[PDB]
Design a protein around this ligand. Structure first.
Ligand code: HEM
Ligand SMILES: COc1c2occc2cc2ccc(=O)oc12
Length: 467
């Protein structure tokens, strides 16, 4: 039947709000799924959204009907600053043009090649110095990890890294951490439903907007400088490249290459290339302290394959199935972006005997794919075996979708995977982790779950490995 997926009856404007717990959107949605099935319709305030739970529904839509589900839906807190500009939250021609250019420009600046691998290895060296600098003292690893991660994408988009002592750099990192935290709280999820009123009201969301505003202001300041020092012949970074394409297109009235898309696209990458990787690393170390046996096996593999002298290199991954399994399990357990970024159908679509009118938003519940009990034996526990066969070799999974899938999937996945492996490996090779508390008492449940999955605050010490 040409019918929209089934779902609970919505009330005018508020939608299904009375049937949802904004502090736990994910659980609220999965519960509703228990009654209506894997594919259902929900009304987040006035926003009608088709929810996709489980591997099959998600893959069937985003991959089997990729083009139809390739539209970009909204994320209200982020659209407040982006407003449809830039590569992430853009649609149609704007997105195709910005995405093609971004992927190309990233590769031209080392992504995938030896260039960025070297940059990551150097930055990891700096992270190691910094952790040695704590003298084994108990610390909050949060900004040690974010400063390192950020410098990778920062050297690509800005021309070079930030000094670890640059206070403005810490400030930008605080803004990123804060925005991801806000969109993961109940107020952030309430904003997803009622932004029409809430953006004009006092409250936590206003402080969230200022963080985005500070990030935009910073990007706009970096662009100006690049502009007044640009060598049309020798671009220094992503910004230069984009400024050059802008000049080339100065004659195309319909060009997507203009200042606003440069500021928004660069901001997209600065944030995207920072907080996601940083949050995964942070959750990862907490999971390893909770499971010493896994850290032990990681240490075994690192000592055999890499040893204690040379810097780990990306190709080492081919020889380390356990480590590769652990990183996969960390991303699977962490479920950093539990509901992906909303997609939307480009045109009237037919999906599993259901009807989805053009423009309909879609929520691919990645978290439900990473925990599909039909793909992982103990979906609720942290267990690397989930990514190993009986002979202890690495085993892929069609349900491993932390980067989502399809036409608007994460094109930073390559950089991210290189970062996760090189940082997790280089740190583990140099230190054993010591929990400020007892393994049995470490809580790995998340502190917040909304747009992102935020792990609980913790402290730890990095103890060197020598004797
Ligand atoms: C552990 C790290 C990361 C995770 C879990 C992650 C996750 C995701 C997800 C789930 C999406 C939405 C995909 C979709 O619509 O289907 C996405 C989008 C995107 N990611 Fe990542 N990401 C990570 C790191 C990166 C990095 C390092 C960069 C930057 C180079 C980045 C750049 C982007 C961009 C530009 C998009 C938007 C793509 C588009 O709309 O066409 N991501 N990411
Ligand atoms: C481009 O990278 C990303 C992301 O990647 C994965 C999640 C995610 C969220 C944002 C939000 C704002 C932004 O500017 O960028 C983002």
């Amino acid at each position: 039947k040409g019918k929209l997926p089934p779902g609970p009856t919505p009330l005018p404007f508020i939608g299904n709000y009375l049937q949802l717990n904004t502090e736990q959107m994910y659980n609220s949605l999965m519960k509703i799924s228990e009654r209506y099935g894997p594919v259902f319709t929900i009304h987040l305030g006035p926003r009608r959204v088709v929810v996709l739970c489980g591997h099959d529904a998600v893959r069937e839509a985003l991959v089997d009907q990729a083009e139809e589900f390739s539209g970009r839906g909204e994320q209200a807190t982020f659209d407040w600053v982006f407003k449809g500009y830039g590569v992430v939250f853009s649609n149609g021609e704007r997105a195709k043009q910005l995405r093609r250019f971004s992927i190309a420009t990233l590769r031209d600046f080392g992504v995938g090649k030896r260039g960025i691998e070297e940059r990551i290895q150097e930055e990891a060296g700096f992270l190691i110095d910094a952790l040695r600098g704590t003298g084994g003292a108990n610390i909050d690893p949060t900004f040690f990890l974010s400063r390192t991660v950020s410098n990778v994408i920062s050297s690509i988009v800005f021309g070079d890294r930030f000094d670890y002592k640059d206070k403005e750099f810490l400030s930008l990192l605080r803004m990123m951490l804060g925005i991801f935290q806000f969109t993961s709280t109940s107020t952030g999820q309430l904003y997803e439903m009622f932004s029409s009123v809430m953006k004009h009201l006092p409250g936590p969301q206003q402080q969230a907007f200022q963080l985005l505003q500070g990030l935009e202001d910073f990007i706009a300041k970096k662009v100006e400088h690049n502009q007044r020092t640009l060598d049309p012949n020798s671009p220094r970074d992503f910004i230069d490249s984009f400024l050059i394409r802008m000049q080339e297109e100065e004659k195309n009235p319909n060009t997507e290459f203009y200042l606003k898309n440069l500021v928004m696209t660069t901001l997209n990458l600065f944030i995207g290339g920072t907080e996601t990787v940083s949050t995964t690393l942070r959750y990862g170390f907490l999971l390893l302290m909770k499971h010493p046996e896994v850290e032990a096996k990681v240490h075994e593999e690192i000592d055999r394959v890499i040893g204690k002298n040379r810097q780990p290199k990306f190709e080492d991954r081919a020889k380390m199935p356990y480590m590769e399994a652990v990183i996969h399990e960390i991303q699977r357990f962490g479920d950093v972006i539990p509901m992906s970024l909303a997609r939307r159908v480009k045109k009237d679509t037919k999906f599993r005997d259901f009807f989805l009118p053009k423009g309909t938003e879609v929520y691919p519940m990645l978290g439900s794919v990473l925990r599909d009990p039909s793909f992982f034996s103990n979906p609720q526990d942290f267990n690397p075996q989930h990514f190993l066969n009986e002979k202890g070799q690495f085993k892929k999974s069609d349900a491993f979708v932390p980067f989502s899938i399809g036409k608007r999937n994460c094109f930073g996945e390559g950089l991210a995977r290189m970062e996760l492996f090189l940082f997790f490996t280089t740190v583990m090779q140099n230190f054993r982790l010591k929990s400020s508390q007892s393994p049995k008492d470490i809580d790995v449940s998340p502190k917040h779950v909304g747009f992102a999955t935020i792990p609980r605050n913790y402290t730890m010490s990095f103890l060197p490995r020598h004797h």
